[model samples]
Target: DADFATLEKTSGGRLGVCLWHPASGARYGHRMDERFPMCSTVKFPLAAAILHRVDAGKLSLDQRVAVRQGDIISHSPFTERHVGKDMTVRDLCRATLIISDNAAANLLLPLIDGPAGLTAFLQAQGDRITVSARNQPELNHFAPGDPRDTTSPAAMAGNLQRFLLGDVLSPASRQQLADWLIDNQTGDARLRAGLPQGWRVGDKTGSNGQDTSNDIAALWPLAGGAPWLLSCYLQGSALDDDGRDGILRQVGELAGARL
Candidate 1:
C-alpha cells in the first residue's frame, strides 16, 4: 500500500497506469482511461496492422519498399544507414519496434493507407480510445495536450493482452512481434529498471522529448508463472527525466514484489 501510494504521489498529477494479471483478470488503475500521446508506442499497433495484411495475403513481408532520398528522418539511429536502399516490410517493422525508428514507421504508413488505417485497425481490435496521427513526423511537432496519436493506458494494456492471446494477428506474426518487443533496446530507465534479478520483461517505451515518459510491459517471473502486464504513462510540462524514471522504477519494484 505504501508503494502504491508513493506511485500516486510521484506521478506528479500527470500519470496514468494500469497493471493487470490476465489469468486472474485482476487489475489496478489510476487514470487508466485517460489519453496520452502514443509516441513510439504507436508502433506496436502499426506493426500488428501490417502483419494482419500479411496474414490476409494483401501484402508480402518480403516485398521490398523503396526508400527515396528524402524519406529518411534523423530521429533514429537505424534509419540513416538504410536510406536510398530497398527494404522489406518485415525489416521495416523490425526497425520500427526494436529500434523505435521514426522514419521506418512513417514509411509503413502508406502501406496501411495512412493513419486512418491505424484507426480502423484499432477499432477492429475493440479499442475506442486509441488513435493514430497522419504520420509520425506530424506527431513530433504536436502539443502535449493534443490527442492526436494517443491511447489510454487501459486500452494499451488490453491491446497487449489481445496480442498475447492471438486475437489480432496470426500466431506466427504475433510471435514475431513479441520477439521484436523482447529485443527492444529503448527505455532502460523505466519498467525494466527495477525488475528483479532473473526476471525478464518485454515492453515498449514512448518519450516525447523529456515532457512525456511512458512504458507498457509484459513481465515474466523468475520461477515461471502467469505474466504480469503494466502500462504507465506520464505527461506534463517541464518534467525531469530522473524524477520520472525514479517513479517508474519504484513502481516496477512494487509490482514485482506484490504480484
Candidate 2:
C-alpha cells in the first residue's frame, strides 16, 4: 500500500506495523515481528496487569500509595502534584496513562511485585516478543533497538487486541484499561494526529530521543464501524519530530480511510 511505501520513504530507519481488526482478523504489516525499545508504551501492559489484580480483588481504586520525595524521579508531571502526599491507585494509573508520568507508573509497581510480575503477566499472555527489565528509568537509557523491555509491533497489537476481545482480562478490567487509553493526553503528532474529527481512539505512544516514535491505537471511526487496531513502531530514525510525525500521520490517514 501507499502508506507502507510512504513510511519506508519518509522514515530514516526501520519500521514495523500491524494494522488489524480483532473482530474480523483482517490485518496488514511490514516487519511486524521486529523488536524495538518500547519506551513509555510499556505503561500499557503494566497498567493492564495491575488492573487484573484489581479485578481479582487484590487491589482497589481507593487504595492509597505514598508519593514521597524519595519516590519522585524526573520526567513526570505527577511528582509535583503527588510529592509528600498520598494518592489513590486509580489516580496514579490515570496519571501514568494519560500523561505518561513516569513517577506515577513507578508507584504502581509494588502492587504487582515489580517488573518481574509484569514480565510474568506478558509471558502468560503468550507474548514471546516483549521483555521488561525494570521500568521508566531503564527506558531512558535504553538503546534504540534494545530488545529488553521491548516489543514487536505485532506483539503490541496482539496484547491489546486480546484485551479488547476478553482473552486477557475481564470485561471490567479491560474497560478500565480502555478508559485510560482513551484519555491519553500525549502523542498529538502520532496516531491521533491525522484522525478524522469526532473519531475516538484509545492508544499509547512511545519515543526516546530523535530515533524513535511509535503509537498503537484502537480506532473507532465516526461512521460507527467496528474498531481497528493500528500499531506502528519506528526505530533508529534520524528525522526530527515533525519529519517522524509526518510519517505516522500519513499512515493514520491511510488506515482510517481503509477501515
Candidate 3:
C-alpha cells in the first residue's frame, strides 16, 4: 500500500512493526522484540491486572465505585469527561478498553490492590515488558532520555493471545474482558482500519498529544483456523497528526499482508 511505502520511505527515524498468529502465526521484525513506550495502550495490563484479581475472587467487578478528578493527575479523557460519577470496576474497565480513558485507568489501578500488586501479577505471568501503573515521574519532566511508559507490540500480542485462549483468567472473566475490548469506542480506525467483512477485534488504541507514539493491538479472525493476534505501535513528528495517521494506515496494511 502507498501508506506503508511512504512510511518506509519518509520515516525520519527508527520505525518498528511486528505481527504474529495465535494458533500458529509467524512473527516478523526486530520490532517484534524491541520495547517502546506503550502510552495509553499500557492500560490493557491494568485492566488485565484487575481481571486477574477478579478471577482469583479477590475483588468483585460488579461493585459500584465512585470516581473524582483528583484521582487522575494526568491529562485524560475520563478525567476531563467523567469528572464526578459512581464508576464501578466494570465501568472503569469499559472506559480503559473502550475509549482508552485515562482517569478510568488510574482509578482501576488502585482497585487492583495498588501498584505493587499489579507489578507482582505481571511478574507471575512472565511479562517482563510492562511498567508500573503510576504516572512515571521522569515522563512528567519530559526527559527524552528517560524511559517512557513502555511495552512491545510482541508482548501485547502474547498477552492478548493468552487471555483469549482462556489462559490468564477464568473462562468467564476472559469472555467479559474480550467483550469490553471488542466494544472499543475507537475501533473504526487504526487497528481495525482494514480487514475483510465480518472480522472482529478486541483491541485498544492509545495516543498522547505531547508524545509522538500511537498504538493498537487486537485479536483478529482471519481466513482460517483460530483467530490471531495483531499489534502495531507508531511514533513520529508530534506536529503532524496526518503523518501519524498515515503511519497507522501503513501498519494496517502490513498486518493485512501477514493475514
Candidate 4:
C-alpha cells in the first residue's frame, strides 16, 4: 500500500499512484482510478496519436507544420525559437516530448483531429478513463475539478504500457515513442529522482502551475528484469512546485523498494 492518507497529511496535497509489473499482472493502487489533470502530460498520448497516423501513412514524419509567431506561447521553449518558421512532424514530436513545447503540441493536435480525437484514439486502445478535451495552453487552465483533460492513474499507466511496451504502435513507431521518452529532458526532480540503481525510466512530466504536478513512465532494470509501469499524479495543495516534486521523488523511492 502507498499510505496515501499519510502522504496527503504530510504533503498537504492529493496523491494518486498506479504501479504494475507487466510480466506478472501485479498492481498497486492508491487513488489510482480517480481523475487528475493531464496538463502537458497529455502530449505523451498526443504524440502517439500522431505516430499512429504515421504508421497508417496518413501522416508522414517528415511532413512539416508551420509554427507561426502567433502560435508561440511562454511555455514553449523549443517552438518559440522557431517562431514564424516550420518543423517536421518528427521535430515537433521530439520538441513536444523532450521540452514539453506547448506550441508544438498544439500543432500536433489537429494532425490527428483534435482533443476529442485524441480521446477517441485512446478509447480505441481500450482506454475508458484517460481523455483529452483541450489543447495545450487551454488544457492548462482548467479549474481544480474540471475534467476537460484528465486521466485516472490506472488508465495512464495502462496507456504507457500499451504505447511503449505493447502493440498499439508498430515496432518502429513504438521504438520511436520509447526513444523520445527515454531521452526526455524534464522530470529530473520527480520520478526520475527516486529510482534505485539499475532501474531506469522513460517518462513524460507536467505541471499546471496551479495545484498539479505529474509524471507517467515505463520502467525497467538492466541486466535482467521484468518491465513495469507507473503513473503518479499529485494535486490539490499549496505545496509549491518543489514540494510537489519531493513527494513524487519519495513516491519513486517507495516504488523502487517494492518493485
Highest TM-score against the true fold, candidate: 4
lDDT of each: 0.80, 0.80, 0.65, 0.86
TM-score of 3: 0.84
- How would you encode candidate 4's per-residue C-alpha lDDT over 155-203 as one tens digit per residue? 9998898888888889999999998999999899889999887876899
Candidate 4 ranges with C-alpha deviation above 4 Å: 143-145
Better of 3 and 4 by lDDT: 4
What value does the lDDT take at residue 255 in candidate 3?
Answer: 68
TM-score for all predictions? 0.92, 0.92, 0.84, 0.96
- The per-prediction CA RMSD against the true structure, in angstroms, equals 2.0, 1.9, 3.3, 1.3
Q: What is the per-residue lDDT of model 2 for residues 1-259, given as tens digits with 9 covering 90 to 100? A: 5568666777878778888887787888777888877888888888888888887788887899988887777768875577777999888888888888888888888788787888888888788778887766776445655667788888998888877655567877788888889889887878788876767898888777677788888887667777888888887777876787877787787777767
Where is model 3 poorest over a 10-residue stretch in terms of lDDT? 136-145
What's the true lDDT of residue 113 in model 4?
Answer: 92
Relative to the true structure, candidate 4 has a C-alpha RMSD (angstroms) of: 1.3
The reply for model 1, stretches above 4 Å from the true place, is 1-5, 11-13, 141-146
Model 3, span 23-129: residue lDDT tens:
66576533666666666676777788888888888888888677675766554565465557676788778877787766677677777666566666766887777
Model 3: how far is 117 from its true place, Å? Answer: 3.0
Off by over 4 Å in 3: 1-9, 72-85, 136-145, 222-224, 236-239
**Residues 1-259, model 1: lDDT tens digits:** 3455557665664678788898898887677888887778888888888998898999889998888768877676666676678888999899888778888898898899888998898898799889887686666444556778888989999988877654678889888978888888886888888877766688888777767777888877768888878888777735577777777777788777757
Model 1 quality (TM-score): 0.92
List candidate 2 stretches off by more than 4 Å: 143-146
